[PDB]
Each structure stands twice: as structure tokens, then as C-alpha cells.
Design a protein around this ligand. Structure first.
Ligand SMILES: CC(C)C[C@H](N)C(=O)O
Ligand SMILES: [Cl-]
Ligand code: NA
Ligand code: NA
Length: 507
């Protein structure tokens, strides 16, 4: 079995796993729609009670399963709770990251294609003060890229260059992942994380030199870090906070478990996971929240910034920032820098959420690495046509997998590790091999505070919000569900195909 050759390489690979698009695209909108600082207070709180404990549990289950040659949540769940329903619940650890990747690769291909369009200079030409006259050309640019429909049919029709860039993005993912751990993700993280940091800091410095009659870049920072105690009683704020914390730290996708499987049994995971979390957070609030929000605020006031944020998720990342850069000297090169930063971010995160399936095919089906990688590729590439051509088929995938399945699977793996596999035993498993020891106070949070807190949050979530999706939506969403549910069944079948061949090799 392969291993992280360099400790630093392990840390950088886990960072690139965590440091992705949620640090640069999701978090700005998440903070803008939720009163800014009013959203920071839960984000901080839920970072201590949910982020770090689930991080350490992810790492512990990963190292435990990897010591016994299993880097997937079905096998590891069977190794923590010996039952068939354990394997059934572990199937989610392969279903969630796959469904996430199905559209994560598409958005990463968006970033790559936009970087190419900006580098070659094939960009819109905004005529020289009306904000609509500047937000309109880049809006139509994004629409010409992804091919959003125009009439009544919810049928996407992406540009040919977009499909070509998607092919190139999948092929780049394949060329990276075909070289394993110590030769592929490690030597790529060692190169991408410094470049990512450099680009982020350069764009931060460039954004801070922006001033308009609608304010300066400091106003967005103020609104971001100005709390508002009038909103801590809104459960939607806490819902969004814990969801974003699950997302930005890869918590609940089973990918951190997958990388932790390649950790040598004796090497540290406590300080490792804490370091990865701290690096991702420093890349989030210090950098990601200090580029989009300050520019949008300085250019349109907090009111119109929140308006653009509530308009859509890509209004800020794919429209607002390029429209603002088109107003500055060398702004085409600046948008190229921004999109290239996003491309490496999505790259280091997407090569991380596609590893559980290959680990399953290698460890549980005894497939060669090349064939496992190529079949997982073909699966993702084919299934991505459902997201590329069916309108609003990405939102359902992100909801059930990246938004609902994450909290569900986090609670599940928490109850499995501590409440089932053994609170004392799993606590020791976390504290074993660690350079530093896990604080005594997080034992109670892991076993008592985190499950009850997440349970109350999930109760409020399911009681006051979900029934709006299973009714007030277009019928085409079923096409996605009918597929993704049918993608779950498929995986279970392979799980069966695992537990049967294991009864054959021993014979
Ligand atoms: C699913 C994860 C890889 C997401 C990533 N941590 C991000 O913030 O974009
Ligand atoms: Cl295009
Ligand atoms: Na992140
Ligand atoms: Na990443």
C-alpha cells in the first residue's frame, strides 16, 4: 500500500483537499446573504464544536482503516460496526463525493475555460457608469459559456468550447490521479498550494487598491467583520454556517478518511488535521472573504452587494469580479489570475473528492490503479452530461449530496466511531500517534455536544425548510433524483460484489 512520502506533502495534500471553491466562491455569498458579521459568530462557534472534532474523527477512522487496508467508509464502517446496515450506510461515503464531483468538475472546467478566454483576450468589451451596463456583458458571457436556456424549456445548451474544456479538465484530472499518492497528489500539492497562496495574496493586495465614490475596499471588510447579535436566533444562519463548515473542510464526504487511510499507522493525525483546518480557514476568511466582498462593496454599496449576492451564487464570482476588473488597468490579466487561482483550487479539491471510488475499486475489488482511475473517470464524464444539459440538475445534486448528505454522514460517522465503536477506544484511536494530545474537553463535545447540537440543527432544518423542494420545483428534478438514487443502488451492488468475492478468495 502506498503512503504519503513526505509529511509536508501530506499536509499540503490535505490543505488542497480542503482549500477549494468553498473558500473563494461559496463563503463570500454565504456571508453576504447572512448579515456578514452576524454569520461570523456561528461560523466561529460551529468551527470549534463541529469542524475540529469531525476533522480528527475523519483522520482517525482514515488511519484506522488504512492500517488494515481499507480506505472507504463501507469497509471502515464494517470495521467499526460489524453489520450489513453499516455497509449500507457506508455506501453514502462513496455516493456523496461522487455526486459532488459530477458538478465540481464542471465548475472547475468553467474556471479553466474562463481563464483561457481571459488569457487569449476573448472577453466582453464594456462600453464606458451604469452598473447594469457593466454587469450585463459578463452575464451574457457566462450565459454563452454554460448555455443557459432562454425560452420555457429547462434545457442547457453549453458552448462547444465549454465541452472541450470539460474534456481537457477530465483528462488533466486523469493525468494527475493516474500516478498515485506519493507521486501524484503529493508532488502536485507541493507545487499548487504555494502558487495558490501567491495568487490569493496578490489579488488581495490588488483589491485593496480600489476606491470608488461608493466606498473603499475596507467597507466590505467592515461589514464582513461587524457582528449583529440580532440574528443568532435565526436558525437559517446556523444552518448555513454548519453547512459551510462541513463544505470547506471536506467534512462528511469521506475524502479526509480516504487521504488519512494513506497515513502510516504511527504518524500524527491530530496536529496534522488541526494544521490542515487552520490553513483552510486562513485561506478562507483572510483571503477569500477579502477579495469578492470588498470589491463588490466598494463598487456598489452594501445594499447592491447583498442584492447581487441574493441574485445567485455565481453573480459574485463569475460576473461581479470580472465586471469590476474590466474597470481597472490590466484587469483582463487580473481576471485571468483570479480564474487561474480558482482553477488550481478546484483542481486540488476535485482530485481529492474522486479518490474514495478509486480506493474502493483498488482495495475492495482488487482492480489495477489504471483501470480503476479510467472507469471512475468514464463514470464521472458520462454522468456529467446530466448536469451539463439539464437545467437546475446541479442544485439538486449539491443539495442532497453536498448540503444534506454531509451533515447526515457526519452524524452517522460520529455515532459509529464514538457511540458504537467505543467512546474510550475511539478517543484513544484519535489520541494515538498524535504528536500533541487531543484536549480532554473535546471528548465530551465529540460524544455529547456535537451529536445533540447537530441533531437540534437537523430537526429545525427538516422542519422549517426542506418541504419547499419536494413540491414547489419543476418536474425535471426527478430526472436528477431518479438518476442519483439509481447511482446509489449501483454502488450498493458493487458493495455486494465486494462482500461476495471476499467469500471466494478465502475459499
Ligand atoms: C468538498 C470539498 C472538497 C470542498 C472544498 N473544501 C471547498 O471549500 O471548495
Ligand atoms: Cl464560450
Ligand atoms: Na474549503
Ligand atoms: Na482544492
Amino acid at each position: 500500500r502506498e503512503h504519503w512520502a513526505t509529511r509536508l506533502g501530506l499536509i499540503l495534500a490535505m490543505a488542497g483537499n480542503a482549500v477549494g471553491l468553498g473558500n473563494f466562491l461559496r463563503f463570500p455569498v454565504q456571508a453576504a446573504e447572512n448579515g456578514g458579521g452576524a454569520f461570523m459568530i456561528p461560523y466561529i462557534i460551529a468551527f470549534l464544536l463541529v469542524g475540529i472534532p469531525l476533522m480528527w474523527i475523519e483522520w482517525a477512522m482514515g488511519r484506522y482503516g488504512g492500517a488494515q487496508g481499507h480506505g472507504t467508509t463501507p469497509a471502515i464502517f464494517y470495521l467499526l460496526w460489524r453489520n450489513r446496515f453499516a455497509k449500507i450506510l457506508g455506501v453514502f461515503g462513496l455516493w456523496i463525493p461522487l455526486v459532488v464531483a459530477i458538478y465540481y468538475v464542471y465548475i472547475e472546467s468553467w474556471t479553466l475555460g474562463f481563464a483561457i478566454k481571459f488569457l487569449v483576450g476573448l472577453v466582453p468589451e464594456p462600453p464606458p457608469t451604469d452598473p447594469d451596463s457593466i454587469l450585463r456583458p459578463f452575464k451574457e458571457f457566462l450565459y454563452s459559456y454554460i448555455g443557459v436556456p432562454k425560452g420555457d424549456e429547462p434545457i442547457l445548451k453549453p458552448s462547444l468550447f465549454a465541452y472541450i474544456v470539460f474534456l481537457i479538465t477530465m483528462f488533466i484530472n486523469v493525468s494527475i490521479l493516474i500516478r498515485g499518492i506519493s507521486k501524484g497528489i503529493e508532488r502536485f500539492a507541493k507545487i499548487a498550494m504555494p502558487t495558490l497562496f501567491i495568487l490569493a495574496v496578490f489579488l488581495v493586495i490588488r483589491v485593496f487598491l480600489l476606491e470608488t465614490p461608493n466606498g473603499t475596499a475596507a467597507d466590505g471588510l467592515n461589514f464582513l467583520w461587524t457582528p449583529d447579535f440580532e440574528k443568532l436566533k435565526d436558525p437559517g444562519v446556523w444552518i448555513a454556517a454548519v453547512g459551510q463548515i462541513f463544505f470547506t473542510l471536506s467534512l462528511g464526504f469521506g475524502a479526509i478518511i480516504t487521504y488519512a487511510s494513506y497515513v502510516r499507522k504511527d504518524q500524527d493525525i491530530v496536529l496534522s488535521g488541526l494544521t490542515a483546518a487552520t490553513l483552510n480557514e486562513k485561506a478562507e476568511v483572510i483571503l477569500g472573504g477579502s477579495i469578492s466582498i470588498p470589491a463588490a462593496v466598494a463598487f456598489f454599496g452594501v445594499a447592491n452587494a447583498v442584492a447581487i449576492a441574493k441574485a445567485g451564487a455565481f453573480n459574485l464570482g463569475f460576473i461581479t469580479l470580472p465586471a469590476i476588473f474590466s474597470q481597472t488597468a490590466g484587469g483582463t490579466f487580473l481576471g485571468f489570475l483570479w480564474f487561474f487561482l480558482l482553477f488550481f483550487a478546484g483542481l486540488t479539491s476535485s482530485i481529492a473528492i474522486m479518490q474514495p471510488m478509486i480506493a474502493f475499486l483498488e482495495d475492495e475489488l482488487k482492480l489495477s490503479r489504471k483501470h480503476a482511475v479510467l472507469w471512475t473517470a468514464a463514470i464521472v464524464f458520462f454522468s456529467a452530461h446530466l448536469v451539463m444539459f439539464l437545467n437546475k440538475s446541479l442544485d439538486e445534486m449539491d443539495f442532497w449530496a453536498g448540503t444534506i448528505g454531509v451533515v447526515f454522514f457526519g452524524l452517522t460517522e460520529l455515532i459509529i466511531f464514538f457511540w458504537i465503536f467505543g467512546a474510550d477506544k475511539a478517543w484513544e484511536e484519535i489520541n494515538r500517534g498524535g504528536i500533541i494530545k487531543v484536549p480532554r474537553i473535546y471528548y465530551y463535545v465529540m460524544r455529547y455536544i456535537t451529536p445533540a447540537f447537530l441533531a437540534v440543527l437537523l430537526v429545525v432544518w427538516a422542519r422549517e425548510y426542506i418541504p419547499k423542494i419536494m413540491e414547489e420545483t419543476h418536474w425535471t428534478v426527478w430526472i436528477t433524483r431518479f438518476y442519483i438514487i439509481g447511482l446509489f443502488l449501483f454502488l450498493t451492488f458493487l458493495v455486494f460484489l465486494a462482500e461476495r468475492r471476499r467469500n471466494h478468495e478465502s475459499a
